[PDB]
């Protein structure tokens, strides 16, 4: 408001807990149309004879400084909480099943997202094995059993199961030719509290 | 017998459970637990109808090997129904026994659970596909021109003579009457009992399985006064504690001789003496007089009236302990004889001591034919998620729902009877109905409707001339734009002489035939158009 809105900025995701319909790129547009409205004054009097080198201008310096503080750190929040919750579900699956939308990528976030994906790439490479065994770590926790059967679940959408089946219809009654490598992604996104 | 086949069962499977039942869930949750024991993942299935089954196999159209269906089988020559069946392992275990033998033979892809004191169909196949007329088996199946290793064509005459003279017994099969047979998963209990499984809750589940259709009026027990030996012999003989049973959780389950009047335990009395058939009809309470004869029995018991409108659980002590200690002996002499039967009971803990059948009358009431369009399968998934010891917030809601239905039932019976809606209409009795209820949409509740009117009218307004005649009923579905449901039901008190109507309605279908369906594996049921029954009823008289 004069530096308050970030609690309003995540509110696009207010309902999006684990029953999420979809997500969007809210709250940047007018808000960084600000920053080019203000730099004019922030560097207006740089070593100027506008006041002939006098002490009085010290509030202006700190004005710029705190403005930068608030802007940058709300940016860190709008970055880091997005990455962190998405990192939770991205530990609940690789890039097998990515986000519900991939339309709310705040455009530069391609680098951000994919770098963290390559965080897990490094993780896989060094960990698991020295050459790198991608170590099955947070999903598909069945003890050694059959490889190919389907079962019942509870209505997920997004429909991104590209893994090894023709079309499995990943919802309740995703009940078709499912191999093990097909069904390798789900433990908790809202799917199989019930076989 | 699968002490030998069960060691085949490790690889992948599909566990199907055909259309909704209490035999179903009881016989299947046990197998769920079994198959999560030896580390296999598997599949449980809902069936809403045989089309759901064919699309299910279509939806499971792979080469899955150990495919299973339970409590079905009489639909097709299932080899003919099932094309991709080439050498796949099928399993039946159904108690609807009167099935054709085309399904039994071809010993690759079926499992003949043929075991009974009835060697009644031994040559039953030796002429149907083995012989033929108007078609080298060296029989009528092959050529019939004096080429098969009084006239040249009396071959066919003797062939059809044998054929039809034993269609005297083929028409006896599937064309005179239907039933069910034996249990749903008591065989499965004794199967698993070799594997050292002392799951008391499994005993309770199979008790639920039997006491559904232990209803010797609905479906026969037979084994009953023999299972008072058998089931106790399963459980009673093997005692894990002779001295340590004063325990909190799941104390080793018991048996006692109690009654089948509805919900004696959880409700007050004078409304719960009112909703059963055997206590009501034999005391005739929908007329005013029945309250008086009831009252004069309450005298002889001398319970208080105020108490008889308090919950049995809510009464003071000594009456509520001495209740059945009295009723069993001074009810035999006052028109009612046969509510006392053989059943079980146990508590989990301290809350209260559930009644061994009082789940099924909540289960039957969990069939919520709601307009959300999903709820039957969700009702299944709730039901099998109910029978445990864990989920219990919902069983009370089930009881509440059940009782309010059971006291809505009568509300229509007085309405229908004393207006004399009992249309005779010839050789049988006949009923008709007009608009929809969420109560009695589906047919289980509909048979429950019929089986109060029936006893009431047919017992009380006639001589003994017509007390043995059968039943039908309408039931509309404003759900599906007008289909005018019907169900067939039997005459009075003939336990073994069960339904003619395994097909008998199909007489009029043979004569004229109008948009008839048999979508359920249940035979005792049909489904129609909205009002295209009247001429079909004129046909369906004889």
Outline of the structure:
This is part of a larger assembly, with chains A (195 residues) and B (542 residues). Chain A is mainly alpha-helical and 195 residues long.
Describe this structure in words.
The structure is cut from a larger assembly and holds chains A (195 residues) and B (542 residues). Chain A has helices at residues 6-9, 29-33, 39-42, 58-91, 109-126. Chain A is an all-alpha fold and 195 residues long. Chain B has 542 residues and is mostly helical. Chain B has 17 helices and 6 strands. Chain B has helices spanning 22-35, 50-59, 78-81, 154-165, 167-170, 186-193, 200-213, 224-235, 278-281, 289-301, 317-327, 360-363, 375-383, 393-417, 444-459, 506-511, 534-539; strands at residues 13-15, 66-68, 254-259, 340-345, 474-475, 485-486. In chain B, helix 1 (22-35) packs antiparallel against helix 7 and helix 14 (393-417) runs parallel beside helix 15 (444-459). The longest helix of chain B has 25 residues, at 393-417. The two termini of chain B are 44 Å apart. Chains A and B meet through loops of A and loops of B.
The gross shape of chain B turns out to be globular
Strand arrangement across the biggest beta sheet of chain B: 1-2
The first-to-last residue Cα distance of chain B is 44 Å
Q: What fraction, in percent, of the residue positions of chain A are helical?
A: 25-40%
Percent of residues in beta strands of chain B? under 5%
Q: What structural class should be given to the helix and strand makeup of chain A?
A: mainly alpha
Please give the most extensive interface between any two protein chains, plus how many residues each contributes.
A-B, 17 and 15 residues
Largest sheet of chain B: 2 strands, parallel
Encode the helix/strand succession of chain B as letters: EHHEHHHHHHEHHHEHHHHEEHH
For the largest beta-sheet of chain A, the strand count, sense and barrel status come to: none
Give the helix level of chain B as a range of percent: 25-40%
Distance between the termini of chain A: 49 Å
- Counting DSSP H or I runs of 4 or more residues, the number of helices of chain B is 17
Give the SSE order of chain A as H and E letters.
HHHHH
The percent range for strand residues of chain A is under 5%
> What is the radius of gyration of chain A computed over CA atoms, rounded to a whole number of angstroms?
24 Å
C-alpha Rg of chain B (nearest Å): 26 Å
Family (chain B): Belongs to the CDC45 family.
GO biological process, one term (chain B): chromosome condensation
GO molecular function (chain B): chromatin binding; DNA replication origin binding; single-stranded DNA binding
Protein name (chain B): CDC45L
């Amino acid at each position: 408001m004069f530096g308050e809105k970030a609690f309003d900025l995540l509110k696009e995701l207010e309902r999006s807990s684990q029953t999420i319909p979809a997500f969007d790129d809210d709250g940047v547009r007018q808000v960084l149309e600000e920053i080019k409205a203000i730099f004019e004054e922030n560097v207006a009097q740089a070593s100027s004879y506008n006041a002939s080198g006098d002490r009085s201008l010290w509030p202006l310096l700190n004005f710029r400084h705190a403005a930068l503080q608030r802007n940058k750190r709300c940016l860190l929040a709008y970055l880091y909480e997005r990455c962190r919750r998405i990192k939770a579900l991205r530990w609940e699956f690789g890039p097998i099943i990515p986000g519900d939308i991939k339309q709310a990528l705040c455009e530069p976030e391609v680098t951000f997202f994919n770098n963290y994906s390559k965080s897990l790439a490094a993780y896989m490479c060094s960990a698991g094995y020295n050459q790198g065994l991608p170590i099955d770590l947070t999903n598909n926790l069945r003890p050694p059993k059959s490889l190919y059967i389907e079962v019942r679940c509870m209505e997920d959408y997004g429909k991104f199961e590209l893994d090894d089946g023709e079309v499995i219809h990943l919802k309740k009654n995703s009940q078709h030719y499912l191999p093990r490598a097909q069904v390798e992604s789900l433990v908790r996104q809202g799917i199989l509290h019930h076989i | 017998l699968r002490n030998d086949f069960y060691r085949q069962l490790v690889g992948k499977r599909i566990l199907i459970v055909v259309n909704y039942d209490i035999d179903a869930i009881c016989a299947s949750r046990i197998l769920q637990a079994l198959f999560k024991y030896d580390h296999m993942l598997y599949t449980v299935v809902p069936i809403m109808g045989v089309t759901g089954l064919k699309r299910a196999y279509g939806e499971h159209q792979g080469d899955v090997k150990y495919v299973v269906l339970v409590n079905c089988g009489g639909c097709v020559d299932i080899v003919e129904l099932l094309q991709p069946s080439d050498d796949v392992t099928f399993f039946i275990c159904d108690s609807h026994r009167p099935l054709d033998v085309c399904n039994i033979y071809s010993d690759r892809q079926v499992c003949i659970l043929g075991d009974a004191s009835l060697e009644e169909n031994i040559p039953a196949f030796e002429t149907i596909f083995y012989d033929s007329e108007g078609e080298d088996s060296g029989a009528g199946e092959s050529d019939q021109e004096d080429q098969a290793p009084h006239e040249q064509r009396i071959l066919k005459q003797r062939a059809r003579r044998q054929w039809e003279s034993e269609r005297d017994r083929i028409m006896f099969e599937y064309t005179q009457f239907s039933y069910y047979g034996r249990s749903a998963a008591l065989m499965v209990f004794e199967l698993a009992w070799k594997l050292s499984k002392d799951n008391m809750d499994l005993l309770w589940w199979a008790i639920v399985g039997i006491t559904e259709q232990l209803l010797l009026g609905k479906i026969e027990s037979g084994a009953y006064t023999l299972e008072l030996e058998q089931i106790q012999s399963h459980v009673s003989r093997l005692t894990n504690k002779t001295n340590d049973q004063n325990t909190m959780s799941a104390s080793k389950i018991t048996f006692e001789n109690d009654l089948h009047l509805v919900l004696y335990r959880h409700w007050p009395v004078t409304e719960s003496m009112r909703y059963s058939r055997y206590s009501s009809c034999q005391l005739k309470l929908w007329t005013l007089r029945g309250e008086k004869r009831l009252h004069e029995l309450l005298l002889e018991m001398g319970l208080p009236l105020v108490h008889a409108r308090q919950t049995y659980g809510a009464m003071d002590l000594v009456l509520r302990k001495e209740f059945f200690s009295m009723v069993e002996r001074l009810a035999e002499k006052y028109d009612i004889a046969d509510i006392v039967y053989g059943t079980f009971t146990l508590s989990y803990g301290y809350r209260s001591r559930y009644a061994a059948a009082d789940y099924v009358y909540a289960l039957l009431a969990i069939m919520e034919s709601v307009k959300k369009h999903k709820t039957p399968e969700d009702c299944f998934l709730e039901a099998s998620d109910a029978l445990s010891r864990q989920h219990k917030q919902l069983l009370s809601a089930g009881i509440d729902q059940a009782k309010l239905l059971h006291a809505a039932v009568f509300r229509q019976v007085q309405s229908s009877l004393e207006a004399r809606q009992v249309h005779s209409a010839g050789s049988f009795f006949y009923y008709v109905l007009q608009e929809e209820h969420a109560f009695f949409s589906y047919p289980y509740a509909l048979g429950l409707l019929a089986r109060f009117l029936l006893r009431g009218h047919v017992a009380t307004s006639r001589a003994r001339q017509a007390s043995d005649l059968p039943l039908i009923a309408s039931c509309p579905l404003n759900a599906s734009e007008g289909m005018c449901l019907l169900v067939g039901i039997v005459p009075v008190r003939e336990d073994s002489p069960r339904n003619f109507f395994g097909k008998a309605f199909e007489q009029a279908a043979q004569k004229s035939g109008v948009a008839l369906l048999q979508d359920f594996f249940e035979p005792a049921v049909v489904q129609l158009r909205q009002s295209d029954l009247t001429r079909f009823l004129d046909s369906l008289t004889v």
